[PDB]
Structure 1
Amino acid sequence: MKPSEMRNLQATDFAKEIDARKKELMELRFQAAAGQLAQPHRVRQLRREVAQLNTVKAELARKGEQ
């Protein structure tokens, strides 16, 4: 979610995690359009989640290739 249990993943295993959230985020976007969003907090959570993956994939790119 946030500490060291996030960086264990390989190359395509990072792009995979993003894609699964973007898809969920879109299913929620469609849910919003048809008056079905009972859990709006889920929206920001996934956006915070995708941000974290994208931030870390840049940390590890510099904590190796310098």
Structure 2
Amino acid sequence: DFAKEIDARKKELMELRFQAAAGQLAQPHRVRQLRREVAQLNTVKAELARKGEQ
């Protein structure tokens, strides 16, 4: 399911990128926030790798 959680931020980042290429990018911060949420969402995966499996 974590891939499902990731690609939603991906698609919003894509359509938001399109909007930036056009005439409307009124909240630039929503960009890097979404990128944050991807990094976090992957970093958490790393913590379930070594945990449990040892």
How far apart are 1:30 and its partner, in Å? 0.2
Counterparts of 2:53 and 2:24, CA distance in 1: 45
Match of 1:34 in 2: 22
How far apart are 1:65 and its partner, in Å? 1.2
TM-score relative to the length of structure 1: 0.78
How far apart are 1:38 and its partner, in Å? 0.5
Q: For residues 15-51 of structure 1, give each alpha carbon's deviation from its aligned partner in whole angstroms, at most 9, with x where no partner exists.
A: 1010100000001100000021111000000000000
**Which structure features the higher share of helix residues?**
2
Counterparts of 1:19 and 1:65, CA distance in 2: 26
Counterparts of 2:30 and 2:8, CA distance in 1: 14
Count of residues in Structure 1 that have an aligned counterpart in Structure 2: 54
One of 44, 47, 53 as aligned partner of 1:59: 47
Gaps of 5+ in 2: none
Counterparts of 1:53 and 1:61, CA distance in 2: 13
Gaps of 5+ in 1: 1-12
Runs of 4+ in 1 over 2 A off after TM superposition: none
